[PDB]
């Protein structure tokens, strides 16, 4: 049994983002070896993705809403830091982040 906010972050926020057309690059960790990105783990000290966030939500890892929001923010900023600002992945990230922020301000008290 989790707090109302955490429940909403899983059943509303994560689930809406997961079903989005641009969720696919964000549903699993970046496999930097398979994708030939030798400096990825050197630049990204804390990889994060929606698949990892989901499991944490489902496992009661998070103490409260803000910790989950922190993970989401890390996922987005990792993408902006690593890629070039015109890359497709970055415009997908921006799109997904605006919806996220949208659903976050809709969060219950
Ligand atoms: C060619 O890309 C892929 C090929 C296959 C796969 S995948 O997991 O094998 N899978 C996705 C789900 N689909 C159903 C099956 C294929 C992922 C990816 N890539 C990503 O995810 C991804 N995500 C980020 C955030 C970045 C990247 C790579 C871009 C630069 C680093 C970067 O920032």
PDB file of C-alpha atoms in Angstrom, residues 25-65:
ATOM      1  CA  UNK A  25      13.492   5.016 -26.302  1.00  0.00           C
ATOM      2  CA  UNK A  26      12.721   5.496 -22.599  1.00  0.00           C
ATOM      3  CA  UNK A  27      11.107   2.172 -21.599  1.00  0.00           C
ATOM      4  CA  UNK A  28      14.452   0.411 -20.892  1.00  0.00           C
ATOM      5  CA  UNK A  29      18.015   1.380 -19.945  1.00  0.00           C
ATOM      6  CA  UNK A  30      20.269   2.731 -22.717  1.00  0.00           C
ATOM      7  CA  UNK A  31      22.380  -0.242 -23.873  1.00  0.00           C
ATOM      8  CA  UNK A  32      25.468   1.764 -24.647  1.00  0.00           C
ATOM      9  CA  UNK A  33      27.557  -1.285 -25.554  1.00  0.00           C
ATOM     10  CA  UNK A  34      25.009  -2.699 -27.989  1.00  0.00           C
ATOM     11  CA  UNK A  35      24.479   0.754 -29.556  1.00  0.00           C
ATOM     12  CA  UNK A  36      28.187   1.605 -29.761  1.00  0.00           C
ATOM     13  CA  UNK A  37      28.316   4.605 -27.344  1.00  0.00           C
ATOM     14  CA  UNK A  38      31.707   4.220 -25.562  1.00  0.00           C
ATOM     15  CA  UNK A  39      31.468   7.542 -23.620  1.00  0.00           C
ATOM     16  CA  UNK A  40      27.822   7.131 -22.466  1.00  0.00           C
ATOM     17  CA  UNK A  41      28.525   5.770 -18.979  1.00  0.00           C
ATOM     18  CA  UNK A  42      31.433   8.241 -18.733  1.00  0.00           C
ATOM     19  CA  UNK A  43      29.079  11.217 -19.259  1.00  0.00           C
ATOM     20  CA  UNK A  44      25.951   9.780 -17.548  1.00  0.00           C
ATOM     21  CA  UNK A  45      26.930   8.941 -13.922  1.00  0.00           C
ATOM     22  CA  UNK A  46      23.313   7.939 -13.066  1.00  0.00           C
ATOM     23  CA  UNK A  47      21.434   6.231 -15.989  1.00  0.00           C
ATOM     24  CA  UNK A  48      17.690   6.246 -15.591  1.00  0.00           C
ATOM     25  CA  UNK A  49      14.697   5.097 -17.595  1.00  0.00           C
ATOM     26  CA  UNK A  50      10.931   4.536 -17.278  1.00  0.00           C
ATOM     27  CA  UNK A  51      11.328   0.804 -16.969  1.00  0.00           C
ATOM     28  CA  UNK A  52      13.526   1.233 -13.906  1.00  0.00           C
ATOM     29  CA  UNK A  53      11.154   3.883 -12.478  1.00  0.00           C
ATOM     30  CA  UNK A  54       8.162   1.579 -13.001  1.00  0.00           C
ATOM     31  CA  UNK A  55       9.798  -1.304 -11.129  1.00  0.00           C
ATOM     32  CA  UNK A  56      10.757   1.024  -8.290  1.00  0.00           C
ATOM     33  CA  UNK A  57       7.146   2.286  -8.067  1.00  0.00           C
ATOM     34  CA  UNK A  58       5.894  -1.327  -8.088  1.00  0.00           C
ATOM     35  CA  UNK A  59       8.390  -2.339  -5.393  1.00  0.00           C
ATOM     36  CA  UNK A  60       7.699   0.502  -2.966  1.00  0.00           C
ATOM     37  CA  UNK A  61      11.204   1.757  -3.457  1.00  0.00           C
ATOM     38  CA  UNK A  62      10.213   5.417  -3.296  1.00  0.00           C
ATOM     39  CA  UNK A  63       9.678   7.148   0.037  1.00  0.00           C
ATOM     40  CA  UNK A  64       7.491   9.804  -1.554  1.00  0.00           C
ATOM     41  CA  UNK A  65       6.456  11.467  -4.813  1.00  0.00           C
TER      42      UNK A  65
END
